[PDB]
Design a protein around this ligand. Sequence first.
Ligand SMILES: O=P(O)(O)C(O)(CCc1cccnc1)P(=O)(O)O
Ligand SMILES: O=P(O)(O)C(O)(CCc1cccnc1)P(=O)(O)O
Ligand SMILES: O=P(O)(O)C(O)(CCc1cccnc1)P(=O)(O)O
Ligand SMILES: O=P(O)(O)C(O)(CCc1cccnc1)P(=O)(O)O
Ligand SMILES: [Mg+2]
Ligand SMILES: [Mg+2]
Ligand SMILES: [Mg+2]
Ligand SMILES: [Mg+2]
Ligand SMILES: [Mg+2]
Ligand SMILES: [Mg+2]
Ligand SMILES: [Mg+2]
Ligand SMILES: [Mg+2]
Lengths: 351, 352
Amino acid sequence: MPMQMFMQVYDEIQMFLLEELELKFDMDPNRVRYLRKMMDTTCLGGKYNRGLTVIDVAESLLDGARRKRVLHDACVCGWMIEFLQAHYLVEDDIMDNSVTRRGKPCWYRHPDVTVQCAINDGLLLKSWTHMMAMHFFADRPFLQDLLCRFNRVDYTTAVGQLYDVTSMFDSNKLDPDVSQPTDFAEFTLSNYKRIVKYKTAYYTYLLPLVMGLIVSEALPTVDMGVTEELAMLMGEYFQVQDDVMDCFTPPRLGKVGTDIQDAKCSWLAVTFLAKASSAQVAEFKANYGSGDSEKVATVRRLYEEADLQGDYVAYEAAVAEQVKELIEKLRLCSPGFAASVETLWGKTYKR
Amino acid sequence: MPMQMFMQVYDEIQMFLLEELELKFDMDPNRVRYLRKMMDTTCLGGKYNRGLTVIDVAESLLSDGARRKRVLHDACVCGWMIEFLQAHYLVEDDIMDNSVTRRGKPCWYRHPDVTVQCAINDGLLLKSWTHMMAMHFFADRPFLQDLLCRFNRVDYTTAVGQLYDVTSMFDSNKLDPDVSQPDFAEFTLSNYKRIVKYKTAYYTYLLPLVMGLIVSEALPTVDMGVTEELAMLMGEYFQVQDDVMDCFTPPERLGKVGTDIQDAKCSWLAVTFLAKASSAQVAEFKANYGSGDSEKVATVRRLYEEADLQGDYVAYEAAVAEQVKELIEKLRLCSPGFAASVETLWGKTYKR
Ligand SMILES: O=P(O)(O)C(O)(CCc1cccnc1)P(=O)(O)O
Ligand SMILES: O=P(O)(O)C(O)(CCc1cccnc1)P(=O)(O)O
Ligand SMILES: O=P(O)(O)C(O)(CCc1cccnc1)P(=O)(O)O
Ligand SMILES: O=P(O)(O)C(O)(CCc1cccnc1)P(=O)(O)O
Ligand SMILES: [Mg+2]
Ligand SMILES: [Mg+2]
Ligand SMILES: [Mg+2]
Ligand SMILES: [Mg+2]
Ligand SMILES: [Mg+2]
Ligand SMILES: [Mg+2]
Ligand SMILES: [Mg+2]
Ligand SMILES: [Mg+2]
């Protein structure tokens, strides 16, 4: 029903955007059609959790008129985030030379899509966030504040990606003017935490919450400090759980996990590295980041014998407690908002 | 002196940005330093025509020292928004086009310790930096919302221009993500004009003018209809002149060997030739165009000469110069300060 509403507004938004292209940018049916397929292919087929969160925050925080328009704004804000994610995933898939996403071939991997056009298709997607904001929210008092907060989270995510991409070798050797080396010097907990904070947490957890508040005109009503705290905790927990399941959950996972072969700066890797003996570490460095089936099994063994599963269980329990405390802090002043934070936490916790 | 001020403000801006990353984004000296070098390599070395126009519009419209000092400083910040936006697109474009050099130097993604993976995202940083610097320096300004919206529109527009450029290559009827890709079928004047309008004209000619008006708080003062008209005229003319010079002006006095024919460009020459040429000429052209072979290039140069495209240019130039003068005058009546800065911008274009 939320989904029904959300998908109906997508059509509304897609229609505006394509008509603007034709009426105001002189575009022709052929190219309009290319971009429609790009939109659809790129923006649809996920679970729209981030969009649907905005809707939920707003409905939680709620005369028919104010309702109808608050919920419509929520939907439009929802699609701003989905479009922004789509922007980053398109460029990421090019960056990472990946092959599929969501079952389907990556955008740039499609037969009549070039890398040349794909990169710029990506840019179009982010621009579309602005265009749909500026149109649907032209009259809203909150437009300026929405734009600025959105800009900040957009910036933040790109900074996340910088941290991800430079997680591979000693940052002391970072130098555009000097050829580049696969070492483990950046594989610390603090560096891991920082990638996940900025790459993921802000736009995945914070931004949906904040946008719910803005279109509800409720933003002053909540303690932002703890709201951010919540968002960072939940965001970090998402990726840690994923990292641990990639290793230790049988393909009931829905795929074969490849984090070890792909030489990932995962929670397992950095947590292992910090606690492991010199002998164990050396075995690790010798067997990590390779397709070879035995080398992989060696790393799984090392993880098992350092009881990283035990470490996760303790970590999860600690996170769950901090989260509940903060939610309660929230609920005291902001019961509607707190409730929806609870709901978001539930689609994450122990999946 | 404008340039002196402009460069001073760059340092101010660079310093804010780098310190924000450190204080609010937890970033370490090592990675700060990488980004400083990216900013520098990437945003510096051009002639800063776009930035400097904003300053000039603003000075020209000045007509206590406090208002002066802050209006000019706002102009500088708007200047750098545009330079940074350009740098954003040029970084991504160089990757898109697998180019080798820009501005004498290696393309950013071409540097030894820059990967394509990192470089694409470096580019995104550049554009986010435009937002961050506006939101900081203009936090208190009444015109912040309107600046951001107008800026966003021209950002959008440029990317749409790139789409037109990139799909200039084969029948747009064959345009289909789900179907592998192969023409000259898109080489029409209309399509040429539309590439240049959206890729180039808005952010190169319109946006600088518009930003000068906003920080001058003078935007309502001017006929935007004709201002827009002029900006399109001047933008198109820029590329046409360049296109004709690529062919016909000697390496000595041009500063390079021009390669538009080898690179199979949708140039003004090519579309104008295609439109007027005889069936036989057209076949010769189609048989020789877009190849490094030195004979085939010379055949095209010959076809161009024999269709007197130089005469066609000379007439086009004259027609543009005149429309532009008419429109400036229209401007000058109500908005003499503005019109004069438009005249100055037009003079940095109208030869060399
Ligand atoms: O590229 P990775 O970090 O693996 C990924 O998580 C995307 C990285 C990313 C970048 C920007 C925003 N969200 C995710 P993927 O598994 O490829 O989706
Ligand atoms: O599993 P991957 O694509 O790597 C990932 O993108 C998983 C992200 C994800 C999203 C939703 C549900 N499970 C995992 P990661 O980059 O590992 O976090
Ligand atoms: O590559 P082209 O499109 O010719 C170029 O003109 C790109 C120009 C451009 C593209 C996108 C945004 N601004 C300028 P270049 O000569 O490469 O700089
Ligand atoms: O000369 P190119 O790099 O191709 C170009 O970028 C011209 C750029 C330019 C700018 C200023 C003066 N001359 C040429 P074009 O792509 O032709 O527009
Ligand atoms: Mg990826
Ligand atoms: Mg990646
Ligand atoms: Mg994973
Ligand atoms: Mg991944
Ligand atoms: Mg190009
Ligand atoms: Mg290029
Ligand atoms: Mg040229
Ligand atoms: Mg060029």
